[PDB]
Design a protein around this ligand. Structure first.
Ligand code: 736
Ligand code: FPP
Ligand code: ZN
Lengths: 313, 401
């Protein structure tokens, strides 16, 4: 039986009968307070009693219900969450109910470390991950980039080892927003742990796919960072068609990303003793200067560092 | 002003007539920012970039004593409020009364646990974030009183109670794990000089597995590269003397791409929005990578500027991230808070102060009174505070066994 902090008939704990046996404990900020918070009086109230209960380490059902309000007033108070999760152990609370709870809390405020770490704990205790991918998807449906949701999602996938349908989920989201960089990351996560990018059949698919996505949204930096990300480990110089492929795009699908990916190719070719080391370089130094003077000035220091490096090898 | 310059319009988003939630929200931001730039080119006067010092001061003035119940959400992050505020004054070169100082100290003594470390407030369990915050606070005050507040011997004992087999650390007992802990740990252990030989054994390697296909670092192995964690990552290594455990080149190429070609400020991650605090988390990596690279005798490094458009960053901050009433902020339209005040300033400082051995080249946008004290790009406190604290604690010996 909980009485909602939002209930119109809510009564401060100092006016409750079931809590008269206990003296609340006011917080001690010392005699000369700094960054002192002038609490509301509902908040002061809840915590003065949390201090009391915590003080005498009262592992009771009322303490349990009190942590709920303490949490609702400041979901970021990790001491409360710790103590609460101590009561789950002592009072042997139905943890599947605790899931329902942490589920509501996360829904209402998903950018909180405590809330997710608390869910993680329940999941570990119950050793049950059956409802995680769905829960995460609902959160990610409200915020397709919630960093906690993804981090929690990878954790689940890699622990319970539930890979089989994730890359499918990744295609779903990229289709909903090809610029969701969290999804491209997720895509690389899924592959890096499933097949890897050695199987030419896969590298092919991905690179073909990525180039296609690039063609559709030329100025989508994620596709590019991904294209360079899956090829940079073996060296872009070992894919002779690639350079060509891109230069065809110069006119119809131009962007300063194309310009910069080329520099990366040239960079890697001098590194791997290409031929026309004289030629290729100037071409590379030209682009770096273009990027520095016109195409991508916000980072002239970088593109001017590049000529300057390739100027000494 | 680089941002008001005509051709700069051209650095406006090109969605390719293929809009997604991303391009849309990005479009909105640029739209508002533009209105800010064009506010000057509005049949009136000459653009005066001025750091509203007097106002940020008064803001920070009370914040150090009291906060409205609006800050009940930061009731578990008070050591931060001290740090954030008591560091913003530092950058403003404002003085920290010898009385308020003792208060801060006594307060932090209350936040400190009899089991090492500091809690988010009086009587809360110790947590590395608060611990980090508490320690910089104390070092910024730099008095032997402040120093003595820190219980070196149990602080180390705390660090071990959290250290993991794979090298990482927990943020607190039964808490979560991500690079923030590595940094907080390495930040306090080093300043207070309590770094044993096996405290951070295997951490450099764990940190390294956080760098992904993007070049940047994620919270944990497998995650998207993000400015906040990238700082904690690199900074942590610089402290551990292991920048090289990372692919510094992909990282550089990553952080540099993080600066917005139009707004001028940085984004915490690719295709994400601009944000004032990242003026320090993202931009801060440059001072760090300059060291790393240079320690490798990199011949292409510059004798005067960091590798990002320092000017654009200062214009973004000054024109877009500053509230009339006082305090800095995320972007226009957003509210002010000590967090952004602490980091838009720290960021500003970095973009206006360059170092590299004999090299010293400052770049101050607007009125020359816009110059802030310099900040150490690793601990993000005063170079002198760092130096003073370090030398002082080395008079003491690491909790020997
Ligand atoms: C209530 S406040 O406005 O003062 N406040 C907002 C919250 C901030 C808080 C935080 C808490 C939870 C999560 Cl998940 C992220 C963040 C964060 N993020 C940085 C990136 N942008 C989002 C926030 C930065 C950050 C860095 C150091 C200490 N606290 C925080 C402190 C300032
Ligand atoms: C020492 C220390 C504690 C450093 C703090 C590092 C830091 C800033 C943490 C990042 C937190 C995080 C998960 C970002 C996502 O928030 P968001 O998605 O709302 O913001 P975003 O869209 O810009 O990523
Ligand atoms: Zn921010």
């Amino acid at each position: 039986g909980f009485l909602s902090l939002d209930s119109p008939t809510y009564v401060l704990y100092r006016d409750r009968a079931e809590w008269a046996d206990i003296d609340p404990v006011p917080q001690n900020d010392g005699p000369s307070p700094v960054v002192q918070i002038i609490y509301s009086e509902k908040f002061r109230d809840v915590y003065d009693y949390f201090r009391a209960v915590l003080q005498r380490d009262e592992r009771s059902e009322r303490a349990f219900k009190l942590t709920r309000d303490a949490i609702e007033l400041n979901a970021a108070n990790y001491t409360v969450w710790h103590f609460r999760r101590v009561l789950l152990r002592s009072l042997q609370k139905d943890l599947q109910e605790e899931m329902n709870y942490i589920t509501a809390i996360i829904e209402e405020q998903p950018k909180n470390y405590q809330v997710w770490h608390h869910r993680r704990v329940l999941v570990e205790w119950l050793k049950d991950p059956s409802q995680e991918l769905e829960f995460i998807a609902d959160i990610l449906n409200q915020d397709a980039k919630n960093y906690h949701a993804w981090q929690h999602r990878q954790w689940v996938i890699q622990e319970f080892r539930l890979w089989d349908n994730e890359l499918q989920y990744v295609d779903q989201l990229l289709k909903e927003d090809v610029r969701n960089n969290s999804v491209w990351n997720q895509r690389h996560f899924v592959i890096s742990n499933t097949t890897g990018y050695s199987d030419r059949a896969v590298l092919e698919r991905e690179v073909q796919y990525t180039l296609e996505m690039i063609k559709l949204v030329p100025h989508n930096e994620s596709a590019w960072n991904y294209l360079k990300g899956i090829l940079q480990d073996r060296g872009l110089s070992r894919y002779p068609n690639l350079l060509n492929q891109l230069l065809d795009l110069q006119p119809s699908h131009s962007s300063p990303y194309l310009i910069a990916f080329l520099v990366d190719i040239y960079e890697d070719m001098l590194e791997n003793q290409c031929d026309n080391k004289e030629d290729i370089l100037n071409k590379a130094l030209e682009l770096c200067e273009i990027l520095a003077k016109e195409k991508d000035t916000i980072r002239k220091e970088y593109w001017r560092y590049i000529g300057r490096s390739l100027q000494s090898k | 002003l680089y941002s008001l310059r005509p051709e700069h319009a051209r650095e406006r988003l090109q969605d390719d007539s293929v809009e997604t939630v991303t391009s849309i929200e990005q479009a909105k931001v640029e739209e508002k920012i533009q209105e800010v730039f064009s506010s000057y080119k509005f049949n009136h006067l000459v653009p005066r970039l001025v750091l509203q010092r007097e106002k940020h001061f008064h803001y920070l003035k009370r914040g150090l004593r009291q906060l409205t119940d609006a800050y009940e959400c930061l009731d578990a992050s008070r050591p931060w409020l001290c740090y954030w505020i008591l560091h913003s004054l530092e950058l403003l070169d404002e003085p920290i009364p010898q009385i308020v100082a003792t208060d801060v100290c006594q307060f932090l003594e209350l936040c400190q646990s009899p089991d090492g470390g500091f809690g988010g407030g009086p009587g809360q369990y110790p947590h590395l974030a608060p611990t980090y915050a508490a320690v910089n606070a104390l070092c910024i005050i730099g008095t032997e009183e402040a120093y003595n507040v820190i219980n070196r011997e149990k602080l180390l004992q705390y660090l071990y109670s959290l250290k993991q087999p794979d090298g990482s650390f927990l943020m607190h007992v039964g808490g979560e794990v991500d690079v923030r802990s590595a940094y907080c740990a390495a930040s306090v252990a080093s300043l207070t000089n309590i770094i044993t030989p096996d405290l951070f054994e295997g951490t450099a390697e764990w940190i390294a597995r956080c760098q992904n296909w993007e070049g940047g670092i994620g919270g944990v192995p497998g995650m998207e590269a993000h400015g906040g964690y990238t700082f904690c990552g690199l900074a942590a290594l610089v402290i551990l003397k292991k920048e090289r455990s990372l692919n510094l080149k992909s990282l550089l190429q990553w952080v540099t791409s993080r600066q917005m070609r139009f707004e001028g400020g940085f984004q915490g991650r690719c295709n994400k929005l601009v944000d004032g605090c990242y003026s320090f988390w993202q931009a801060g990596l440059l001072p760090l990578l300059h060291r790393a690279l240079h320690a490798q005798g990199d011949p292409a490094l510059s004798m005067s500027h960091w590798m990002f458009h320092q000017q654009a960053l200062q214009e973004y901050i000054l024109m877009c991230c500053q509230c009339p009433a006082g305090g800095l902020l995320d972007k226009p339209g957003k509210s002010r808070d000590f967090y952004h005040t602490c980091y838009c300033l720290s960021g500003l400082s970095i973009a206006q102060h360059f170092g590299s051995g004999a090299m010293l080249h400052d770049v101050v946008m607007g009125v020359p009174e816009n110059v802030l004290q310099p900040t150490h790009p690793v601990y993000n406190i005063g170079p002198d505070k760092v130096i003073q604290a370090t030398t002082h604690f080395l008079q003491k010996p690491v909790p020997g066994f």
